[PDB]
């Protein structure tokens, strides 16, 4: 850190670790930092290369959070739990990785827990994932007897003398293990073959290639998707954490190995954006801490140019204007600012104050580019009511903290009726008097409100419009069918009378709101439900009690498609129907099934649903 720190777009290594509940994700973080070492991202130093940790979404399947940060981060570290295999958030995290294309590597820990074994996992790879992976180590001594690890592809063997991690010695493969060994290497040259002719060449020859040219030709098949790396080890005793950081310097890539960012121009012509230091900046604003004491840090990552301390930049998702106060970069033990983030880099701001998770930033007279509160697209309302995506974009509604999912009914009329609001009463309040005539009539789905005053010769005295309006107004919050709001409607105010003394303001009012509640009931009312449309990975075993479970839940499905291994349904299903579904639909896939929906259109609950809804 600090002294001797080299930049070189080509030494740096920003990688995210991904796995299962209780695989092991930050025991492994945990031990990388205190490997290297003697927050949205933190950063350490490997082998002069700058190895910048990206912290993953815990909950598997929030994908804004997940969609977002495989796009900040360039490689993946996928962590199993040796005794498991390949598991659900696993297999999750594996299309997760392949929809957005990042190299990765994987780590079967917990190598010395009881029920552990390397091939296990290979297996479940290879089936469930449809991964071809590539054994380059070999255990030696097994559960409570784990103890070594052995390079393959290098044919080195390594002991751990404790479960502390202060003893460590190379030493020659045990004679026990040579053949195994002898013939893992050769099945790894027989890979590397795949990725550099001159490697075939050799091995028909019987020749031994060089260490450089088998990472080379490995690196090359990892970045390109092809293969996918295992390793080993017991993070929590201290048994090939150092290997597994080689690891990510030899083959996850750097931001020069992965495929240019594109954003949108300021007219809508998507361009790449290479990362090249010397031309614009373009950032990208993926988190926002609040920290308990130097204030809102910004996370972003820098796709191109340089951004510099203390200089305007330009939000471009928001048209503001912004002042870079510092600039951070969060360590295991220690901030550390800086006077610039080159592209490819990344760290925290401190000075940002109208940039939110998703922002774009480029700077002075770069082109206004768009590349895409902490945020989690919630929406506050009133006793509370916090609106949100699941559990426009917000149609299920939670109150307070109690009250369960409710799905945002609205309710119309299909019927033009003219009706008569009125009002008469003794009240302490003197006389009060008021009447209304108006009709109510449907407008085209999703047309909105439109309120048309057709009173002549003054029936109602013009200082009561106002109020009838407001009467109206406050009726439609709540539909005679569930009291869901009223939407959709045109009512025009045509006739009605006054008392000279008697009318008043709250006379009118009251008269308006009435009027309404009757068109409405009289106008054959409907109620008009959310209809979500929904993407479920299946894996192809499962894709017939799947679509079946659709069809009942009143769905309709659009189309298939494959994510490599599995198969993707679309369709619209009532968000109604589509609750619990998450734990129904794992049951349904044997946890390996996962979908997303988003809100699509508003439609009529069907007559059935309405007698049920209504009663
Ligand atoms: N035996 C053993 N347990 C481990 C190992 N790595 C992680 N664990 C245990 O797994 C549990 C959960 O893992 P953890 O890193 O803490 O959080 P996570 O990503 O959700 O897994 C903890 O009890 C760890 O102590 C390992 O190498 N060996």
């Known amino acids: 850190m600090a002294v001797k720190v080299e930049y070189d777009l080509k030494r740096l290594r920003n990688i995210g670790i991904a796995a299962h509940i209780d695989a092991g994700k930050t025991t492994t973080t945990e031990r990388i930092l205190y490997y290297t070492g003697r927050a949205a991202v933190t950063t350490c130093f490997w082998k002069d290369h700058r190895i910048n940790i990206i912290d993953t979404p815990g909950h598997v399947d929030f994908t804004i959070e997940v969609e977002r940060s495989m796009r900040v981060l360039d490689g993946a570290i996928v962590v199993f739990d040796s005794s498991q295999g390949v598991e659900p958030q696993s297999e999750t995290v594996w299309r997760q990785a392949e929809k957005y294309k990042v190299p990765r590597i994987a780590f079967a820990n917990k190598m010395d827990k009881t ?28 559960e409570d007897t784990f103890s070594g690890i052995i390079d393959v592809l290098r044919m080195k063997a390594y002991t751990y003398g404790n479960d502390l991690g202060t003893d460590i010695r190379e030493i020659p493969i045990p004679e026990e293990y040579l053949d195994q060994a002898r013939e893992y290497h050769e099945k790894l040259v027989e890979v590397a073959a795949d990725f550099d002719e001159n490697i075939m060449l050799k091995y028909l020859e019987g020749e031994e290639p060089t260490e450089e040219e088998l990472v080379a030709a490995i690196r090359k098949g990892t970045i390109d998707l092809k293969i996918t790396p295992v390793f080993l080890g017991s993070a929590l005793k201290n048994k090939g954490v150092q290997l597994l950081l080689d690891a990510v310097v030899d083959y996850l890539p750097s931001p020069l190995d992965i495929p240019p960012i594109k ?14 230091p010397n031309g614009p900046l373009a950032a990208l604003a993926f988190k926002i801490m609040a920290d308990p ?11 191109s140019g340089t951004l510099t301390s203390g200089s305007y930049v330009y939000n471009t998702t928001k048209g503001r204007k912004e002042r870079v106060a510092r600039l951070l970069r969060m360590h295991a033990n220690h901030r550390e600012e800086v006077e610039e983030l080159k592209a490819g880099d990344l760290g925290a701001v401190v000075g940002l104050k109208e940039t939110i998770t998703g922002d774009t930033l480029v700077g002075e007279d770069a082109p206004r580019v768009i590349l895409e509160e902490e945020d989690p697209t919630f929406r506050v309302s009133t006793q509370t ?65 439109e309120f048309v005053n ?28 569930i009291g869901f709001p009223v939407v959709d409607i045109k009512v025009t ?10 009318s008043s303001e709250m006379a009118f009012k009251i008269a308006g709101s009435m009027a309404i509640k009757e068109a409405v009931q009289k106008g054959d009312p409907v109620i008009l439900e959310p209809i979500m449309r929904v993407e479920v990975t299946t894996p192809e075993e499962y894709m017939g009690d799947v679509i079946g479970d659709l069809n009942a839940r009143r769905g309709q499905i659009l189309g298939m498609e494959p994510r490599g291994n599995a198969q993707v349904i679309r369709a619209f299903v009532p968000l109604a129907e589509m609750f619990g579904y998450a734990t129904d639909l794992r049951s349904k896939t044997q946890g390996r099934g996962s979908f997303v929906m988003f809100f699509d259109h508003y439609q009529e609950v069907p007559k059935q649903v309405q007698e049920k809804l209504i009663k």
């Open 454 to 481: 057709a009173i002549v010769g003054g029936v109602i005295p013009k200082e009561y419009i106002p109020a009838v309006q407001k009467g109206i107004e406050e009726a439609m919050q709540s539909g005679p069918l």
């Open 493 to 502: 105010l045509y006739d009605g009378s006054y008392h000279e003394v008697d």
């Open 263 to 276: 954003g949108t121009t300021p007219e809508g012509e998507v361009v790449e954006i290479h990362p090249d």
């Open 385 to 449: 009511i916090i609106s949100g995506m699941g559990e426009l974009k917000r149609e299920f509604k939670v109150d307070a903290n109690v009250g369960k999912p409710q799905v945002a009914y609205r309710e119309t009329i299909t019927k033009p009726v003219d009706v008569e609001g009125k009002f008469i009463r003794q009240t302490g309040g003197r006389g009060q008097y008021g009447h209304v005539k108006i009709k109510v009539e449907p407008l085209p789905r999703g047309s909105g409100f």
């Open 293 to 303: 004491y130097v204030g809102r840090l910004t996370f972003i990552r820098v796709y």
């Open 115 to 142: 029920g552990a074994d390397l091939w296990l996992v290979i297996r479940t790879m290879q089936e469930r994932l449809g991964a071809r992976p590539v054994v380059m180590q070999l255990p030696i001594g097994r």
